[PDB]
From a paper:
An alternative, promising approach involves protein capsids, such as encapsulins, which can be viewed as genetically encoded enzyme encapsulation, and is particularly suitable for immobilization or within physiological conditions. The capsids, comprised of 60–240 subunits arranged in an icosahedral structure, engage with a conserved C-terminal encapsulin localization sequence (ELS), or a more extended N-terminal encapsulation-mediating domain, found on the guest protein. Our study showcases the encapsulation of the nitroreductase NfsB, which we produced as a fused dimer, within encapsulins.
Cryogenic electron microscopy reveals the overall architecture of the encapsulated dimeric NfsB within the nanoreactor environment and identifies multiple pore states in the shell. The cryo-EM map in this area was ambiguous however and appears to be the superimposition of flexible states. To resolve this, the pentameric subunit was examined by 3-D classification and resulting volumes were refined using local refinement without symmetry constraints. This isolation a series of volumes that could be categorized as open, closed or uninterpretable. The open and closed particles were pooled and refined to yield complete, unambiguous maps (ESI†). The closed pore inner circle diameter in this structure was 4.62 Å. The primary drive of this is a shift in the pore forming loop (measuring 3.84 Å between the displaced His188 alpha carbon, see attached movies M1 and M2).
Numbering used by the authors:
A (entry chain TA), B (entry chain A), C (entry chain WA): 2 to 265
Write the structure that this text describes.
Amino acid sequence: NNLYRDLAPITESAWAEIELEATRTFKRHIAGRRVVDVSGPNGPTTASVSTGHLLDVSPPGDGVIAHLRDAKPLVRLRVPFTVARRDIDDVERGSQDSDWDPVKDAAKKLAFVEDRAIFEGYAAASIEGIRSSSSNPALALPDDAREIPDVIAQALSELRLAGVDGPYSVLLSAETYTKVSETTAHGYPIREHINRLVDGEIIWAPAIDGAFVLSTRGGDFDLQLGTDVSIGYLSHDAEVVHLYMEETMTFLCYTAEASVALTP
Amino acid sequence: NNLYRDLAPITESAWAEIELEATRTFKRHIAGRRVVDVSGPNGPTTASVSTGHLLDVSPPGDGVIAHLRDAKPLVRLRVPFTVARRDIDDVERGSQDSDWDPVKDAAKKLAFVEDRAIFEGYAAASIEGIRSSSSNPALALPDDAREIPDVIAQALSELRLAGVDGPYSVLLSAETYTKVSETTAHGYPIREHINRLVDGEIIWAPAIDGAFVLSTRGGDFDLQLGTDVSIGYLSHDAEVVHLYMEETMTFLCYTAEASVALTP
Amino acid sequence: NNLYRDLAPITESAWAEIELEATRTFKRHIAGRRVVDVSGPNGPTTASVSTGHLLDVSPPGDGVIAHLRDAKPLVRLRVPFTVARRDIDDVERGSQDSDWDPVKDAAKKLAFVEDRAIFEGYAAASIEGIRSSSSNPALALPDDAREIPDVIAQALSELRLAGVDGPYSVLLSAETYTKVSETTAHGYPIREHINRLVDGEIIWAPAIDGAFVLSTRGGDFDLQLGTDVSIGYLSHDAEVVHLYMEETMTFLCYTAEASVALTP
């Protein structure tokens, strides 16, 4: 009800088209949710996640010991966008090529923001990313792609020597993903070697910079959602309708030695 | 299990006696829980209470609007105390007059701390009390007790003129309670007049300073408990056992004009 | 009962977390138990393993022949470690990132000790390892990884010429494992060649020095356990709890020509 979608001059079919486009774009442009554990929507009443720690505070009086409970607040991210009214009206007339580019742009922006917060951190929201939280030393991606299989093999060894078990996955930036896809060593593609090195999967991650090697055993990275991605309405005009894409979330990292970062 | 009561050299009967004494003392010395609404124990995993508000924060990037969710953290209060081992051992021998004075002192201290936090506030825990949160102007208790019925009648009128309804209750400090109990006007006790003025009850509140006139309709004052009063064990010796009384709580005031403070 | 875990100030959830971490780390860091035959726990009353041989001794008197029965005693290995009490207490408050690094370190130390005893021997315990017990001549690992497939093929031939049958497995040190994983010959990875040479499996063995080629038909290597890995409690303080990881075991090698050692 807080979305006020009933006040928007948008028909049911137009809403369905917009939602389909947004879902497709967000699914295509998101990679963090494919590795970390998602704590599903807890409702609009959720404002923070309890960590279970205690913080020393001044006692209310003599002879009393006081401790505050520690919690991490959620953050709400809102990406506004605008949709032309003629495109909405053409849907009911059988139009199959309505312009939903703003929806795609908003979905891409929200997905990139979420991925960067998960992996690179968001200081204002008190989110420490996987890269900063990792304790394993960071490796460097080689200049030539033919050496990528070696470095990924060095990281895995680290994860094995730290006691971290379970399937291992590699998240590669767009440039690194393309380089690995097209590179061959004496005619032998290097993807067929990385696929054998890694028993998990290679993930298309267009939002990160370098590469990440993580252990997907479970219980190391938790994305807490208070509210999942939702589309709402602000106002409209004789020509345009103003909507927004919204999400309330936070990220927590528990295991520091379950990730290795390969810098560019 | 976190109380570690199984490691203490205390028998079941001694535990029962200690708990009975603590419960009696805390019930006798507490007055805040008789007026405000208690949100019962939510378990050890509760660290904060969501308020439903939003705080502006710096956006993660251009074209995005960010808001943090606001929450009030809980605070844990711990009052340690010590019990002699001979008194514990005498319980199994049929002793009916074991020394539980430390338990009573700890219970009184915890109850007074909780009452003062509810009514006078606790800045370090971000708790704003009923007195500071109230918007109605504060009245002054008269020098002579015979005029107390008039001032209480002035406060009620205020509560009526602000639109606040429901039963009205008066919390009186120990000195004011005794003065009202013993005072008479031309032989007519003033308690029989205050009882007719007030359709709720007169509450013995030995922790507050002056007096409070509140509306007990409901939904104005909320004491959130993460964990109720519990007794735990720290360590022991050949002569003494070290225990503590613990409670995790916070207080929230919603209706500012549902209370009037009568200063001493 | 001899572990005295009931005296420890540790809750059930903390015990579960500690045991889970220890099991994960030990499973990740152990390789001997994946090849040899494990004679399961026989109970605390087991003190030695009978070999079935006889030792000449001085007769008690004229006209009598005396022989002592030969047995190999078990050895108990204990690795103490310490855990902070605040981390234990945070588990009941919903903490998901408690510090169990000491448990991981103890598990790694115990696993490495057991692996080195199985493969390199432990003279004080009268344990002769696989390397010293082997009768086949030891080969040398080549300087360049591209020649590793050849040497492993030389060892297998030896095992075939000695009459040893059954699946063959290769245990590689961490360095050799990584080298084999990353090395390629004219773009063709050498793992795809070693996997075809060997009909068993390639085992990650971070405790051994060079490499081992063994026959896993069965009945050649026996790890006798009197008591499996178990966690016990020694004492505690106001800040820390002292625990230990314990195991009673011995190792026996029967077939001398069922193993080949490739030195670094």
